[PDB]
Amino acid sequence: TLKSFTVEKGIYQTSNFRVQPTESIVRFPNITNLCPFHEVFNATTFASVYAWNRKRISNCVADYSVIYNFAPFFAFKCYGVSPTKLNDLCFTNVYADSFVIRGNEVSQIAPGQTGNIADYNYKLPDDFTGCVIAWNSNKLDSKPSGNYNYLYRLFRKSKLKPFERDISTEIYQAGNKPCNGVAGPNCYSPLQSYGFRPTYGVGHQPYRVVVLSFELLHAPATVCGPKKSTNLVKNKCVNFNFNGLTGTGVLTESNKKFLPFQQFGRDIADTTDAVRDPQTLEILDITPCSFGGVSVITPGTNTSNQVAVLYQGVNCTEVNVFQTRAGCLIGAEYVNNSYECDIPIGAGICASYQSIIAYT
Amino acid sequence: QCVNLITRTQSYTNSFTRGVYYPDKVFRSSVLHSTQDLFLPFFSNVTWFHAIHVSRFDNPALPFNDGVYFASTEKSNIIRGWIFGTTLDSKTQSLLIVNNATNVVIKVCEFQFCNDPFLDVMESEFRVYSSANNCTFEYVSQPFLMDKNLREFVFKNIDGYFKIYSKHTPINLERDLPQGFSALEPLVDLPIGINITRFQTLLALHRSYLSGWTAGAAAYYVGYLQPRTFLLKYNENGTITDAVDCALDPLSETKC
Ligand SMILES: *[C@@H]1O[C@H](CO)[C@@H](O[C@@H]2O[C@H](CO)[C@@H](O)[C@H](O)[C@H]2NC(C)=O)[C@H](O)[C@H]1NC(C)=O
Ligand SMILES: *[C@@H]1O[C@H](CO)[C@@H](O)[C@H](O)[C@H]1NC(C)=O
Ligand SMILES: *[C@@H]1O[C@H](CO)[C@@H](O)[C@H](O)[C@H]1NC(C)=O
Ligand SMILES: *[C@@H]1O[C@H](CO)[C@@H](O)[C@H](O)[C@H]1NC(C)=O
Ligand SMILES: *[C@@H]1O[C@H](CO)[C@@H](O)[C@H](O)[C@H]1NC(C)=O
Ligand SMILES: *[C@@H]1O[C@H](CO)[C@@H](O)[C@H](O)[C@H]1NC(C)=O
Ligand SMILES: *[C@@H]1O[C@H](CO)[C@@H](O)[C@H](O)[C@H]1NC(C)=O
């Protein structure tokens, strides 16, 4: 500090003592109001690909772990986002689209793909942000007589735009002559039936597909991943994250009676002095960890190399140890005798070299 | 089923020191805190509306402006909620707040509102709106109109959140905008994210069963918030017991 190899006799303020944080405590409100993924990925009846079901998802917590563990998935392809980061991301809206297709066409449910399903039944945009999930549904959707309740659109005048649905059953007119709304030669009904049977090859077995589309808008994002409760540790210097408010401090018990709306507390000087725990509605007094001004008391180097350390403002129990009003003095022995001041320690206490002694 | 039944008259009164609310959720004890926010100015001009139905359209939609201070001395049953929006038709989203004794339902949908919307008592919302479509929000909670008693609300639409503040202050023979300070506790913060420029009050009408509806009167006060700097006094327990409006007069300005 003094930029010299020889130190003159005196007390020099050289450093700041700090109490290092020991643990990290993150307290967040209880997980509740989870998004109804269990009603999308586990439905008694799914929908035809032409009349694909769309559920808007808003104002809930998105627990994707239940989606992960629901079934073994033929594809969990995610476009524009990684699967792991989804929980730590918060999106304004989540759209869940549910339909049943044959296995061969599962590849068609992707950006930039072509087929009967992509052109005429369900289309994803090139810039799509979301995931496509598919799983086998032989037990649920296959009958030996044949399941004729799943339909697809084979014929349409123009390709579908992304996120568009056509429910029209109008006869597809492939020829110059008018159909007249009655099926006739060169006139074919657009919706064909997926005649699912249990003994079909894996390419043709029914597969249930759920498409999750995530969109962000200027409105505040209200669908975000689960918040970890973690645990609460008190009476120690721990880094605290309470509802996105961060710091480092001891959390002692509080006698302050908060009103129910209030969540945080502030000092006269606009520094946080209190908080309400989200998990349990209790009030805690946030006190920052101890700090001190480390001062080195030394005589001249030539005379001796012994030093004493004064922690300014720090009680002795929080760091030849003596307690002074100035702070805790370590390395000097208190002597009852009174002498003239040689090195001032403050608060009526002075130090001298005879070992290093401290006296009034 | 839209019918015009309500006629409205208006008078002017003094705000006094009503309309103070807690600007944030921070607990402050034994301090003087100066905050700049949308507040109702002290001793401002407040419109007193008398809505009468006796057994043509005379109940126009009020402008929301930057926020609204609402007060009523009527019982909980007569006034049942509010309507918020811009066009108040199917094209744009709208916010409907409806209270009944068991609970409060706050719902945001594309309501095609009637010119004179009222809840008729079972309770039917057919009068309130002909149709509701593309509904995007629903929140159900304990009611804030419960049972002489002056009920005060402050509505703000800031940064896509609809902040609602409320207080229930008993009053005696003294005029319905009383003296003194009743700080308004924050009640419900809603992430509606919609544009609100106009609002209307919802009243309840009873069927006559004998002049289809029973005759009724409702009195309510509307004031408008302005961007103002206030100095609030926080006591030992965190309650706001006093405030000074800085721009109102030189003495308060010196205090601020
Ligand atoms: C008061 O409002 C609540 C909420 O709108 C009504 O409660 C609902 O009543 C319907 C009956 O049509 C039930 O299907 C719902 O399950 C109820 N919801 C809740 C949250 O309870 C209640 O009926 C209304 N009371 C009156 C007298 O109108
Ligand atoms: C999921 O589907 C199976 C099929 O029978 C059922 O047993 C289970 O209860 C369902 N789980 C949920 C959470 O719906
Ligand atoms: C959250 O969980 C705790 C412990 O399970 C419980 O005591 C508390 O009532 C719950 N709810 C809230 C709003 O804190
Ligand atoms: C309130 O406004 C009305 C018209 O807007 C006006 O006539 C009246 O004088 C105002 N009140 C006061 C106290 O200025
Ligand atoms: C609103 O409703 C109409 C008819 O129900 C529909 O055409 C339109 O796409 C809807 N818009 C949204 C955003 O849901
Ligand atoms: C809010 O609505 C008003 C009334 O239609 C309109 O003039 C204004 O431009 C709207 N604000 C925005 C940001 O769209
Ligand atoms: C504040 O709380 C204390 C403790 O409950 C109570 O005695 C006192 O009356 C309250 N009000 C004021 C103005 O101090």
Numbering used by the authors:
A (entry chain A): 302 to 620, 641 to 675, 691 to 696
B (entry chain B): 14 to 23, 27 to 71, 78 to 143, 153 to 178, 187 to 249, 256 to 301
Original paper wording:
The XBB.1.5 variant of SARS-CoV-2 has rapidly achieved global dominance and exhibits a high growth advantage over previous variants. Preliminary reports suggest that the success of XBB.1.5 stems from mutations within its spike glycoprotein, causing immune evasion and enhanced receptor binding. In late 2022, a recombination occurred between Omicron sub-lineages BA.2.75 and BA.2.10.1 resulting in a new variant XBB.1 and its further sub-lineage XBB.1.5, the latter of which rapidly became the most dominantly sequenced lineage in the United States. We find that while the XBB.1.5 maintains a high binding affinity for human ACE2 as similar to previous variants, it has a diminished affinity for mouse ACE2, representing a departure from earlier SARS-CoV-2 variants.
